[PDB]
Every structure is written in C-alpha cells, then in structure tokens.
Design a protein around this ligand. Sequence first.
Ligand SMILES: *SCCN(C)[C@H](O)C(C)(C)Oc1ccc(Cl)cc1
Ligand SMILES: *SCCN(C)[C@H](O)C(C)(C)Oc1ccc(Cl)cc1
Ligand SMILES: [Mg+2]
Ligand SMILES: [Mg+2]
Ligand SMILES: [Mg+2]
Ligand SMILES: [Mg+2]
Ligand SMILES: [Mg+2]
Ligand SMILES: [Mg+2]
Lengths: 5, 5, 236, 236
Amino acid sequence: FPATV
Amino acid sequence: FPATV
Amino acid sequence: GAMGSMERASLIQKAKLAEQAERYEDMAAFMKGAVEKGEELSNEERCLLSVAYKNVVGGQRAAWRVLSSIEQKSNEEGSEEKGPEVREYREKVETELQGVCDTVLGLLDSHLIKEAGDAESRVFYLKMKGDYYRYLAEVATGDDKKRIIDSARSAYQEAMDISKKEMPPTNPIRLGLALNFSVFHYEIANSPEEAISLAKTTFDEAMADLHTLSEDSYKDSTLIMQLLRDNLTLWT
Amino acid sequence: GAMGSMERASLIQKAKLAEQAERYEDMAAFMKGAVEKGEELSNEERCLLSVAYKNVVGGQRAAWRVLSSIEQKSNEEGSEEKGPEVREYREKVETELQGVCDTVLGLLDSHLIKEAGDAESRVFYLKMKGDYYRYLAEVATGDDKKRIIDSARSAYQEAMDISKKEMPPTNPIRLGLALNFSVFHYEIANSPEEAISLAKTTFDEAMADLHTLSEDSYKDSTLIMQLLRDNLTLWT
Ligand SMILES: *SCCN(C)[C@H](O)C(C)(C)Oc1ccc(Cl)cc1
Ligand SMILES: *SCCN(C)[C@H](O)C(C)(C)Oc1ccc(Cl)cc1
Ligand SMILES: [Mg+2]
Ligand SMILES: [Mg+2]
Ligand SMILES: [Mg+2]
Ligand SMILES: [Mg+2]
Ligand SMILES: [Mg+2]
Ligand SMILES: [Mg+2]
C-alpha cells in the first residue's frame, strides 16, 4: 500500500 | 521478560 | 457519552497514557470524550485525535483486506464451497470499520470543522474528513458509492484550496494532505496520472521552499517529502 | 451469550479467520462461544483457545506494565503531583485484564477440566489454569493475593504430576508447562533456585529422549527446549 499520514 | 508459551 | 463525567484535561492526559501503552481504542475513546466537551482543540490535541483513530481504523482496514482476499479466493474457479462464514466475518469487520468512520465524521461535523477558523486547524480537519470518507469508499459497493467518493474528493479539495492560499508549500499539514489526496486519486478515483502529478508538483514546490526553514522544520518537512517520493517510486 | 446462535463449526471457522486477520479479541470471543457449546475440544481447538486468550491478555499485561511503571515513577521523590489519572487508567486496564482472566478460568471450571480425561487435554487445561491465576497474581495486592498465588501453584502442580506420569519428557505440552511453572517460581513465588532447577532438569530429561522422535517431533520439542535454555541464560 502507498504511504498516507 | 522470560519466555512462556 | 461514557466520558461525560471526566474532566477534559484528564481525558487528554489519559489519551497520552493510552498512546504510550499502545491502547489506541482507549486513546480514541478518550479523545472522542475530549472533543465532545465542545471546546476547540489545540495543535497537539488535534494530533492526538488523528493518531488515535488512524491506528484504530488502520487495524480494521488491515483486517478487512485479509478477509476480503480470503473471500475473493473462495469465489474463484475450483474453490470448495465453505459456506457464508467468510462473507459474514468480513461484513462484521466492515460494519465496525464503517462505525468508526461515521463516529469520526460525526465529530468533524459536530462541530470541529464549523468552529475551525485558522488555516492549520481547518485544513487538518478537512483532510481528516477526506481520509475517513476515503476509508468508507474502500469498502463501498452500493448505490451511494459514487457519492462517498465525491464526499472524500470534495473535502480534500476544500482543504487543498485553503492550504495553497494560506500555508507555505513546506507546511507538514499541507504536505500530508497532498500525500493523501494523491493516494485518493491513485487508489479510489482511478486517476493515477493525477496522483503522480499532484505528488510530483507538491514535492518540487516544497523542495524550493526548504531554504527558508530552520533545521527542525526542515526535518519535519523532508520527512513527508520522502513519503511523496516513496509513492512516486512505487507508481513510476 | 452473543455466540449462542452461531454453529459450533462456524465459530471454529471464524476463530481461524480472526487469527489470520490478527483480530485476537474476536478470536477469543468465537472460541468462548465454541467452548460454551458444551462439547469437548480437539487438540487443534485447544490451541485456538489458548492462542486467542494468550494474545488478548498478553496485550493487556504489556499495557499494564507500561502504566505501572509510569505510576511508580510518579510516586518517587521529586516527582510533580499529576493527580489520580495514572492510577485510574492503570486500574481500568487492570480491571479489564482481571475480567479476561476470570472469563478464561470460568471456561476451564465450567466445564473443560472436569470433562478432560486424556493426559494431553487435562494437562493443557490445568496449565492454562495456572497461567491465568499467574496473570491475576501479577497484579494482585489485597487480602487474597497469597491465595491467588497458591491457586496458580496448585494448578501447575497437578498438571506436572499428571505430565510426569503420562507423557514422555519431550512432549511439547509437558515442556511448555514446565517452562511456565518455572517462570511462576522465578517471577511470582520468589523462588529463583526452584525456577532454575526445574528448567534445567526439564531440559536435560528432554535432551535424553530426543533420540526416540521423528524429525517433525524433534523440531516441536527442541523449539520449546530452546525457550528453557533462553530462560536459564537470562537467570544464570
Ligand atoms: S499530527 C500526528 C503527529 N504527526 C506529527 C505525525 O506523527 C507525522 C506523521 C510525523 O506527521 C504528520 C501527520 C499528519 C499530518 Cl496532516 C502532517 C504531518
Ligand atoms: S497450542 C498453540 C500452538 N502451539 C503449537 C504454539 O504455537 C507453540 C508455542 C509453538 O507450542 C506450544 C504452545 C503451548 C504449549 Cl502448552 C506447548 C507448545
Ligand atoms: Mg471541567
Ligand atoms: Mg457491508
Ligand atoms: Mg493542479
Ligand atoms: Mg449445531
Ligand atoms: Mg485493582
Ligand atoms: Mg523436582
């Protein structure tokens, strides 16, 4: 999965 | 901590 | 609410203790109680709120993906009928996830967003609103799925418009919003070119503003820039 | 019970799904429902029960230790009075932990142990009874603390007596019982010499029986022997 904050 | 199972 | 009888400061204190103990369900319940006191949140308290629910819903999403994968495998050619149990349990986890998202969206709507006037708070809450509609969109399949996706898009877009007007391009909240909106484009809206364009333009504009920053601000901004770069590398 | 309407086999199926999703609270609730169907458990189902609650109470113990350490620091010389919040939250976690231990002990008492006739099931359940009284002993401070410790000791001792009579010294359940009873001696009963003696004698007697085992049994037994060795190295 791609990075999210 | 020591190991327990 | 079960936290109605606890002091606001005690709820904040216990949210920090729960984070230290990695008890994120407790942390979220304490922060929900703090929000429901009706006073605006500080920068630090907004972070506590975001961290608590990000960890709770993150665990639910991880579990939902495990179960969805098992469910998809069970419905492929040659699989043995195992009964309704996989779908039931995936639905149970999905319903609990939706419940958490609805709770967070309810806090934002009653009444965090309407009282947030400063750019740093308003953009933070609108980013959160985009995030939790995005999590609803990840599991959505019914008549309102397109409306859920557009609710996420609309919240992210209002946050972007404010952030571009009111924040420097290195502001970590602006950067984190752009990171997540880019992921929304890639994973939810089937718009990989928009995802890549937004991540690249965000990264380049922040790069050109780094020279204005202290060492500590530089560390904060470059941390999220690296996440933009990681996604670009994954996507190109 | 909320699981009374679900099929036993469906509860077992969902416990396995919950383990795959690392949803150990769900796993324990499903296995509690399975036990309450009233039928005896298979070897595999006993493992599911043990894994589920071991993970739930393990997380609670980890959190309790974090909070207890914060609490102890707050009551040392020169610390600033922070109010009742740390103690309150440590007590909240402690009460939830005790609740889980009481639930497990209740399943063992009603009626897993009394129906367990084979050595492999009876020793397994009595080891569990010792374990969950041990977890109660870790947080105990009142009039019944010595009785809690003796309840753990008594359950472990009955399990040891059966295991030495009815199981080979390499049996993984016998080994895991001895491992945990040794930890009970060291950490709960203030008997480090008994802890070390039991761990060493258990290890040596298993070593001498390895030659009787298949490759797969050898792997199972040596795995727990290494845990005995790790503790001995920590303690000597
Ligand atoms: S606000 C929660 C604490 N922040 C500082 C995070 O831990 C990290 C990931 C380091 O930074 C950000 C989180 C969220 C946003 Cl919108 C921006 C930065
Ligand atoms: S019964 C739960 C599954 N077992 C096989 C465990 O995963 C390990 C730790 C490998 O082995 C034992 C657990 C408990 C006991 Cl009493 C003995 C071995
Ligand atoms: Mg007050
Ligand atoms: Mg559904
Ligand atoms: Mg543009
Ligand atoms: Mg039936
Ligand atoms: Mg107490
Ligand atoms: Mg002896």
